[PDB]
Amino acid sequence: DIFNRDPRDHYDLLQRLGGGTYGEVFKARDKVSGDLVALKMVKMEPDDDVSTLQKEILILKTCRHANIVAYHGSYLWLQKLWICMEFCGAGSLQDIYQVTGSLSELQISYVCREVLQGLAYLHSQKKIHRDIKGANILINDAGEVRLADFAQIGAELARRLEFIGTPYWMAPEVAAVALKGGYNELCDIWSLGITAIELAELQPPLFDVHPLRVLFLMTKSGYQPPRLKEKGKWSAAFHNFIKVTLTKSPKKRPSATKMLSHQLVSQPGLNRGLILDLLDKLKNP
Amino acid sequence: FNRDPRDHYDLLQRLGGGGEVFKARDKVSGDLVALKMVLQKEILILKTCRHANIVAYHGSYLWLQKLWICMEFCGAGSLQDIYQVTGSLSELQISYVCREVLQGLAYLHSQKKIHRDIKGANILINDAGEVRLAGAELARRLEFGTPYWMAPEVAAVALKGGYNELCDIWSLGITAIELAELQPPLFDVHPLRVLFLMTKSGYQPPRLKEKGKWSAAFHNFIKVTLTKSPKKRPSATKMLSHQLVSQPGLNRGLILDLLDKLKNP
Numbered sequence: 396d397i398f399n400r401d402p403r404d405h406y407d408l409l410q411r412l413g414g415g416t417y418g419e420v421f422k423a424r425d426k427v428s429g430d431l432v433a434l435k436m437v438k439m440e441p442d443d444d445v446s447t448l449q450k451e452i453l454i455l456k457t458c459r460h461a462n463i464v465a466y467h468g469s470y471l472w473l474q475k476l477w478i479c480m481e482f483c484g485a486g487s488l489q490d491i492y493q494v495t496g497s498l499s500e501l502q503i504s505y506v507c508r509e510v511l512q513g514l515a516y517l518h519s520q521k522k523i524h525r526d527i528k529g530a531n532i533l534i535n536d537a538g539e540v541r542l543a544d545f546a547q548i549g550a551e552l553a554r555r556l557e558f559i560g561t562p563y564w565m566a567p568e569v570a571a572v573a574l575k576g577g578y579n580e581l582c583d584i585w586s587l588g589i590t591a592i593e594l595a596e597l598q599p600p601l602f603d604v605h606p607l608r609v610l611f612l613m614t615k616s617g618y619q620p621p622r623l624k625e626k627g628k629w630s631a632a633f634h635n636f637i638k639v640t641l642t643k644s645p646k647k648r649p650s651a652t653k654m655l656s657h658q659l660v661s662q663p664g665l666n667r668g669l670i671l672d673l674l675d676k677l678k679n680p
Numbered sequence: 681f682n683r684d685p686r687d688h689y690d691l692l693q694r695l696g697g698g699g700e701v702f703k704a705r706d707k708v709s710g711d712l713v714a715l716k717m718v719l720q721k722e723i724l725i726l727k728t729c730r731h732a733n734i735v736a737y738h739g740s741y742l743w744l745q746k747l748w749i750c751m752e753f754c755g756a757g758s759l760q761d762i763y764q765v766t767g768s769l770s771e772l773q774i775s776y777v778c779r780e781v782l783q784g785l786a787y788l789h790s791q792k793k794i795h796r797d798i799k800g801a802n803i804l805i806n807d808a809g810e811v812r813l814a815g816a817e818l819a820r821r822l823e824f825g826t827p828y829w830m831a832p833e834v835a836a837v838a839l840k841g842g843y844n845e846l847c848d849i850w851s852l853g854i855t856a857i858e859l860a861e862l863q864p865p866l867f868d869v870h871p872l873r874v875l876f877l878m879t880k881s882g883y884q885p886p887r888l889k890e891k892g893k894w895s896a897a898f899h900n901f902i903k904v905t906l907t908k909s910p911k912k913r914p915s916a917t918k919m920l921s922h923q924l925v926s927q928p929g930l931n932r933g934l935i936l937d938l939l940d941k942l943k944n945p
């Protein structure tokens with residue numbers, strides 16, 4: 396039920412949390428109670444279909460999972476869609492590791508297991524996250540791990556159609572690849588393996604190499620998937636987790652459900668207490 | 681070469697861009713050329729593709745952060761530039777254009793190349809009535825983000841797309857409708873809607889609008905080039921045996937007539 400009210404009548408915007416081409420995300424406060432929410436402001440276009448928006452917003456509402464940022468309703472006011480979500484007080488793992496430094500292997504194991512639970516849920520609903528990275532993994536003050544449920548409207552769709560070009564002369568099989576864009580559900584599994592190296596080393600592999608060079612090497616017959624830099628620092632289970640998630644061929648890359656049975660994320664002692672320790676380090680180094 | 685093209689050519693007028701393409705003249709002989717102002721592997725493959733229906737490559741210059749590709753000049757510009765003044769082309773003119781484009785495409789496809797952008801705007805016409813197919817664009821492509829977390833199959837599509845050689849055959853069938861009607865099918869429909877409709881099951885490949893105006897051979901040419909499944913779409917060599925492009929009387933004289941109409945409509 397997309398409310399046709401201005402969210403600024405119920406919420407005070409307190410802080411710009413992030414943003415990009417799509418719009419902005421804010422920390423907001425209920426003017427009456429004082430509860431904290433995250434409000435995602437998405438710029439609509441005049442050509443965007445309301446039917447598609449109602450379909451996406453209805454499925455978003457019924458897509459309940461503990462590792463997915465909670466949906467609290469949405470507002471549609473003056474060409475702007477505002478999605479109201481649960482606020483995660485610590486921000487992203489990128490926000491955290493930029494102060495705390497690299498995460499321990501047990502902390503990464505817990506993060507990976509929670510992300511894999513969220514990914515198994517999305518993939519069961521025929522969804523693809525498409526952007527697994529430290530910046531997109533949220534942590535609340537309880538040490539819990541959340542992914543946000545998402546690009547197919549407004550300025551992000553306008554920009555993607557500008558990359559694709561005019562479609563009038565495109566054969567249908569070219570149009571189909573331009574819609575999909577290489578994304579398949581197993582691309583989130585590769586992205587999680589890169590994110591695990593990112594949490595361990597504060598950068599993804601090849602961060603200092605020019606993006607075109609990276610893209611080129613990736614598309615060459617015989618590309619070597621990246622690995623952890625310090626071998627001795629990490630267990631054999633962590634090296635193997637990176638090895639199987641970074642399987643080059645998507646036909647051989649394990650699914651999220653299969654990855655949930657891997658030794659690294661199946662081990663005992665993986666709980667939010669590991670992240671409460673990380674959050675303590677954030678307060679006082 | 682590592683010379684300033686200013687030493688070998690006299691710049692005449694700007695033709696277009698979005699780098700830039702110019703019209704230029706040989707300071708000694710008086711030959712006219714097109715200079716594209718924008719590597720070793722791309723230039724070698726470019727130099728190697730030599731067919732009569734492909735814009736001739738005359739060398740390249742690298743001077744002061746600028747690559748200049750010297751090509752043969754086609755005095756009349758593109759078929760889109762022409763039909764915007766002359767109006768729709770006759771069936772015989774389209775048959776000749778399609779045959780010449782198919783010859784060029786058979787040549788590119790034999791060299792394991794894909795044109796990727798067959799359309800009226802990309803088909804060049806010289807003053808002789810002949811038909812030819814021919815930095816910041818790469819920086820813009822990279823800007824559309826960080827690839828560090830990308831799976832390899834995502835990186836491959838971000839650098840190749842869904843392009844296959846038979847996509848040029850579908851594009852030529854759309855271009856034939858474009859030359860006949862002054863617009864490709866669905867030109868007034870939003871691009872996302874077009875993309876969406878194309879990826880549906882009950883999708884009907886487009887057709888010519890006024891049935892009686894065109895021969896059965898032209899409707900059949902549109903029918904086979906616009907075969908939905910690429911596994912069933914005919915190759916350029918196969919299309920060269922189709923009755924529309926095999927008919928006698930297809931010659932540059934048809935386009936010299938079109939060019940005369942462009943001077944004095």
Ligand SMILES: CN1CCC(c2ccc(Nc3ncc4ccc(-c5cnn(C)c5)cc4n3)cc2)CC1
Pocket residue numbers: 411412413420433435464480481482483484485486487490533543
């Ligand atoms: C210096 N500061 C700057 C501020 C930093 C911060 C950043 C985020 C938060 N919380 C937070 N909660 C819930 C959220 C729900 C959804 C989103 C969402 C959906 N899409 N996209 C792109 C972001 C983002 C969400 N974000 C708190 C703090 C910390 C470090």
Ligand SMILES: CN1CCC(c2ccc(Nc3ncc4ccc(-c5cnn(C)c5)cc4n3)cc2)CC1
Pocket residue numbers: 695696701714716735751752753754755756757758761804814
């Ligand atoms: C009103 N006028 C404006 C001027 C218009 C014109 C436009 C072009 C020409 N010739 C001409 N020849 C040869 C060419 C070879 C290559 C290219 C190339 C490669 N890449 N890219 C983007 C363009 C372009 C080439 N162009 C003559 C005329 C006509 C209509």
